[PDB]
Design an enzyme around this catalytic site. Structure first.
Site, PDB file in Angstrom:
ATOM      1  N   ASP B  12       0.907  -1.238   0.136  1.00  0.00           N
ATOM      2  CA  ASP B  12      -0.018   0.027   0.042  1.00  0.00           C
ATOM      3  C   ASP B  12       0.939   1.169  -0.119  1.00  0.00           C
ATOM      4  O   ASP B  12       1.811   1.150   0.657  1.00  0.00           O
ATOM      5  CB  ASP B  12      -0.964  -0.115   1.340  1.00  0.00           C
ATOM      6  CG  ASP B  12      -1.938   0.858   1.166  1.00  0.00           C
ATOM      7  OD1 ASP B  12      -2.885   0.407   0.460  1.00  0.00           O
ATOM      8  OD2 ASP B  12      -2.016   2.210   1.571  1.00  0.00           O
ATOM      9  N   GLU B  14       0.999   5.487   0.513  1.00  0.00           N
ATOM     10  CA  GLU B  14       0.405   6.832   0.638  1.00  0.00           C
ATOM     11  C   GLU B  14       1.132   7.950   0.047  1.00  0.00           C
ATOM     12  O   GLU B  14       2.322   7.646   0.021  1.00  0.00           O
ATOM     13  CB  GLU B  14       0.400   7.154   2.239  1.00  0.00           C
ATOM     14  CG  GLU B  14      -0.441   6.212   3.229  1.00  0.00           C
ATOM     15  CD  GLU B  14      -1.877   5.872   2.841  1.00  0.00           C
ATOM     16  OE1 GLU B  14      -2.304   4.817   3.236  1.00  0.00           O
ATOM     17  OE2 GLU B  14      -2.345   6.678   2.146  1.00  0.00           O
ATOM     18  N   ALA B  15       0.506   8.814  -0.622  1.00  0.00           N
ATOM     19  CA  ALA B  15       1.213   9.855  -1.174  1.00  0.00           C
ATOM     20  C   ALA B  15       0.463  11.190  -1.267  1.00  0.00           C
ATOM     21  O   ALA B  15      -0.385  11.153  -0.693  1.00  0.00           O
ATOM     22  CB  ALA B  15       1.186   9.589  -2.766  1.00  0.00           C
ATOM     23  N   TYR B 120      -3.276   2.940  -9.469  1.00  0.00           N
ATOM     24  CA  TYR B 120      -2.630   3.954  -8.590  1.00  0.00           C
ATOM     25  C   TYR B 120      -1.350   3.352  -8.151  1.00  0.00           C
ATOM     26  O   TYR B 120      -0.291   4.031  -8.535  1.00  0.00           O
ATOM     27  CB  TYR B 120      -3.441   4.149  -7.197  1.00  0.00           C
ATOM     28  CG  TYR B 120      -2.967   5.437  -6.665  1.00  0.00           C
ATOM     29  CD1 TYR B 120      -3.379   6.734  -7.103  1.00  0.00           C
ATOM     30  CD2 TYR B 120      -2.198   5.244  -5.506  1.00  0.00           C
ATOM     31  CE1 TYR B 120      -3.096   7.850  -6.190  1.00  0.00           C
ATOM     32  CE2 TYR B 120      -1.882   6.207  -4.608  1.00  0.00           C
ATOM     33  CZ  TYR B 120      -2.112   7.677  -5.274  1.00  0.00           C
ATOM     34  OH  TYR B 120      -1.648   8.670  -4.542  1.00  0.00           O
ATOM     35  N   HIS B 179      -6.250   4.597   6.242  1.00  0.00           N
ATOM     36  CA  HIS B 179      -5.299   5.350   5.268  1.00  0.00           C
ATOM     37  C   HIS B 179      -3.739   5.794   5.640  1.00  0.00           C
ATOM     38  O   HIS B 179      -3.206   6.450   5.201  1.00  0.00           O
ATOM     39  CB  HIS B 179      -6.241   6.672   5.164  1.00  0.00           C
ATOM     40  CG  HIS B 179      -7.292   6.626   4.603  1.00  0.00           C
ATOM     41  ND1 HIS B 179      -7.564   6.617   3.520  1.00  0.00           N
ATOM     42  CD2 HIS B 179      -8.658   7.008   5.503  1.00  0.00           C
ATOM     43  CE1 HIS B 179      -8.794   6.431   3.105  1.00  0.00           C
ATOM     44  NE2 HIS B 179      -9.549   6.559   4.353  1.00  0.00           N
ATOM     45  N   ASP B 184      -3.481  -0.081   5.915  1.00  0.00           N
ATOM     46  CA  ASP B 184      -4.361  -0.246   4.874  1.00  0.00           C
ATOM     47  C   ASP B 184      -3.835  -1.938   4.222  1.00  0.00           C
ATOM     48  O   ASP B 184      -4.604  -2.467   3.783  1.00  0.00           O
ATOM     49  CB  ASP B 184      -4.093   0.602   3.470  1.00  0.00           C
ATOM     50  CG  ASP B 184      -5.114   1.938   3.971  1.00  0.00           C
ATOM     51  OD1 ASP B 184      -5.804   1.678   4.634  1.00  0.00           O
ATOM     52  OD2 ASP B 184      -4.577   2.867   3.477  1.00  0.00           O
TER      53      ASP B 184
END
Ligand SMILES: Nc1ccn([C@H]2C[C@H](O)[C@@H](COP(=O)(O)O)O2)c(=O)n1
Ligand SMILES: Nc1ccn([C@H]2C[C@H](O)[C@@H](COP(=O)(O)O)O2)c(=O)n1
Ligand SMILES: [Ca+2]
Ligand SMILES: [Ca+2]
Ligand SMILES: [Ca+2]
Ligand SMILES: [Mg+2]
Ligand SMILES: [Mg+2]
Ligand SMILES: [Mg+2]
Ligand SMILES: [Mg+2]
Lengths: 213, 223
Positions: B12, B14-15, B120, B179, B184
């Site tokens: 996973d 996060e960006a 993504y 998140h 996640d």
């Protein structure tokens, strides 16, 4: 006297037995936490772990099988780890660990419960076996004599479970797994962060002074 | 067509935002699970799913070159300043060495698993890796659980197939640490375990070669 560490890497090891049994590392877990997160812990309404928390957990098949005591404790066996296709403590482990530590702002302070007698010399044996080295300014902190000492200044058991039950009035989980124990150690540390950071700023031992098991 | 994967690496990201803003990875988390743990999902005496005991993990935070969007920062609970305060550099060589070492510890072939991975995570990871000229093992494949679970429900015959909705639908509880990268992946792994036989079968049949993944965007420059 020791260098002021910027990142504290809490670590824990699961191995195949006690020190004089020539134990092999079967599992290692590391939680890296910047100093600023320890100096000002977050609390919802109780301690919550820092948001920015680099983490690494690796399982490895030891060349020497476990002991019954160690196996039942950790919930691991040589057969179990092989079944999940894990090789032993090799160059891949070293490359991953060195990469993980280089992601941390130095100087680094390794933190482990009873590290002076177990985790540090065992890790050193494994690293030295592969001719691997840690950053020169790396130091380390054993929370066992540190917590005992801090209490002298003010009979009790200082096991990881006893401490958690004493500070948080609850049972830790998941005990005896590498990642679980680091999680428990980090909460204990947070509960006494100022005193322990102070302890580290003075009493933290140079990693070079750690001798192989 | 695809190779039979032995290790499923759930990941996973996060960006800093959504694809059209050319986001940068601020956090990555990977759970490596051997196929055997997925073929026979271990369950406690209560019968509920538990995560495999042998579970390699890697979570890394990094300060992106460009800052978060208002939404992205609020969602992830991350910010450029907070990542800087904790002394985290950006997606660099150290990230690659750690990532590549982590993957090398896994028995191959490897199947990367990510929710909405095709749209993504995989393109974004590809962009960052190409920036540093890094490559994954050739035999690596990847699985997007979003079209997979949609296809499976279509097969074994509107509903949302977001991570949150699926966890709610399968476990009927709120996911913890939503998140966050590690949070996640934890959620994803449980969802996968809930339907592991089907998803394994899906992977053996339709897992895409990583070499076919295109970058989300062409990175500016360097190093
Ligand atoms: N009475 C004991 C307790 C632990 N160990 C071994 C197994 C563990 O892998 C390691 C200690 O790890 P931990 O303290 O995290 O359980 O030493 C042992 O040999 N005898
Ligand atoms: N409505 C949304 C959904 C996602 N993201 C970004 C933030 C996250 O860093 C990344 C992945 O989303 P998530 O944390 O929900 O998995 O995409 C966003 O900016 N706005
Ligand atoms: Ca090797
Ligand atoms: Ca009690
Ligand atoms: Ca989603
Ligand atoms: Mg220990
Ligand atoms: Mg332990
Ligand atoms: Mg995601
Ligand atoms: Mg996420």
């Amino acid at each position: 006297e020791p260098p002021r560490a910027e990142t504290f890497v809490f670590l824990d090891l699961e191995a195949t037995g006690l020190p004089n049994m020539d134990p092999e590392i079967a599992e290692i877990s590391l939680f890296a936490v910047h100093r600023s997160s320890l100096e000002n812990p977050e609390r919802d309404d109780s301690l919550v772990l820092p948001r920015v928390l680099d983490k690494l957990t690796l399982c490895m098949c030891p060349e020497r099988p476990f002991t019954a005591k160690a196996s039942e404790i950790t919930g691991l066996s040589s057969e179990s780890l092989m079944h999940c296709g894990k090789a032993g403590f090799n160059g891949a482990v070293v490359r991953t660990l060195q990469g993980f530590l280089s992601r941390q702002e130095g100087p680094i302070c390794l933190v482990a419960h009873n590290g002076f007698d177990y985790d540090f010399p065992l890790l050193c044996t494994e690293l030295q076996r592969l001719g691997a080295h840690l950053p020169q300014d790396t130091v380390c902190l054993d929370t066992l004599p540190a917590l005992r000492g801090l209490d002298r200044a003010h009979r009790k058991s200082y096991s990881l479970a006893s401490l958690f039950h004493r500070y948080f009035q609850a049972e830790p989980s998941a005990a005896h797994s590498a990642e679980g124990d680091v999680h428990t150690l980090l909460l204990i540390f947070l509960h006494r962060a100022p005193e322990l950071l102070a302890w580290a700023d003075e009493q933290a031992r140079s990693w070079a002074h750690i001798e192989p098991m």
